[PDB]
Amino acid sequence: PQITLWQRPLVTIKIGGQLKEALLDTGADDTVLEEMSLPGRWKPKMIGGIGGFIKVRQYDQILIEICGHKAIGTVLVGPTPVNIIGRNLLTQIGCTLNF
Amino acid sequence: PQITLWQRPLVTIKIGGQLKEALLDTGADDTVLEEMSLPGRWKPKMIGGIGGFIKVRQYDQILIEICGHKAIGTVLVGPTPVNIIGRNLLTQIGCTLNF
Ligand SMILES: COc1ccc(S(=O)(=O)N(CC(C)C)C[C@@H](O)[C@H](Cc2cc(F)cc(F)c2)NC(=O)O[C@H]2CCO[C@H]3OCC[C@H]32)cc1
Numbered sequence: 222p223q224i225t226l227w228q229r230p231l232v233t234i235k236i237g238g239q240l241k242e243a244l245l246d247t248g249a250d251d252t253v254l255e256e257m258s259l260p261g262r263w264k265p266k267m268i269g270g271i272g273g274f275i276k277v278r279q280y281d282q283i284l285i286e287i288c289g290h291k292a293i294g295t296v297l298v299g300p301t302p303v304n305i306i307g308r309n310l311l312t313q314i315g316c317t318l319n320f
Numbered sequence: 321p322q323i324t325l326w327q328r329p330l331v332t333i334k335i336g337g338q339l340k341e342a343l344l345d346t347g348a349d350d351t352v353l354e355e356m357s358l359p360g361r362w363k364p365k366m367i368g369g370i371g372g373f374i375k376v377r378q379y380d381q382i383l384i385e386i387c388g389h390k391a392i393g394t395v396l397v398g399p400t401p402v403n404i405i406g407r408n409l410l411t412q413i414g415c416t417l418n419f
Pocket of ligand 1: 244246247248249250251252253268269270271272303305307345346347348349350351352367368369370400401402404406
C-alpha cells in the first residue's frame with residue numbers, strides 16, 4: 222500500500238497469536254509493543270524516548286505479520302503508550318518514505 | 321526522493337535562519353525541535369512520549385524548509401533529544417509511506 226500521513230499510519234499486526242494495531246514509525250529504530258504475553262526467553266533492557274527512559278523486555282527472533290507481510294526480528298515489550306513498528310521491521314517489509 | 325529505512329531518515333532543514341538535521345518521523349503527530357532561538361511568541365505546552373512528558377514552547381505558523389520543500393505550521397521547541405519532523409509538516413511536503 223501507499224499510506225499518506227493525514228492520519229496516524231496504523232496497521233493490523235499478528236504477533237504471539239494475538240491481533241493488535243500498531244504505528245508504522247520511521248522515527249523508531251526498534252519495535253516496541255505494549256505489555257503483552259509473549260512466549261520464550263527475554264533480556265531486560267532500557268530504551269530512551271522523548272520524556273525519558275522505560276524498561277522493556279527484549280525478545281529476539283519474534284515473528285510478526287504486519288499488513289499481510291511476514292517479518293522476524295527483535296521486539297521490545299513494555300510500558301509504551303502505543304504499539305510502534307520500528308525500522309528493524311520496516312526494512313523487512315520493504316517500507317520506504319517518498320516525497 | 322525515495323528514502324529506504326536501513327538508516328535513520330535524516331534530512332537537512334532550515335528554520336529561523338539556522339541549518340539543522342531532523343528525523344522524518346511518521347510516528348510523531350507534531351514537529352518537535354531541540355532547544356533553539358526562535359523569534360515569535362509562544363504558548364506553553366506539554367507533550368507525551370515513550371518515557372513520559374516534556375514541557376515545550378509551541379510556535380505557530382513557522383516556516384521550515386525541509387530538503388528544499390517549504391512548509392509552514394506549528395513547531396514545538398523543548399528538551400527532545402532528536403529533532404523530529406512530524407506529520408503536521410510531512411503532509412505538506414507530500415510525504416508518503418510505501419510498501
Ligand atoms: C505531540 O506530537 C508528538 C510528537 C512526537 C512524539 S515522540 O514521543 O517523539 N514519538 C511518538 C511515540 C509513538 C513514540 C515519535 C517517535 O518517532 C520517537 C521519536 C524519537 C526518536 C529519538 F531518537 C529520540 C526521541 F526522544 C524521540 N521515537 C522513539 O521514541 O524511539 C525510541 C523507541 C524506539 O527505538 C528508538 O528509536 C529512536 C529512540 C528510541 C510525541 C508526540
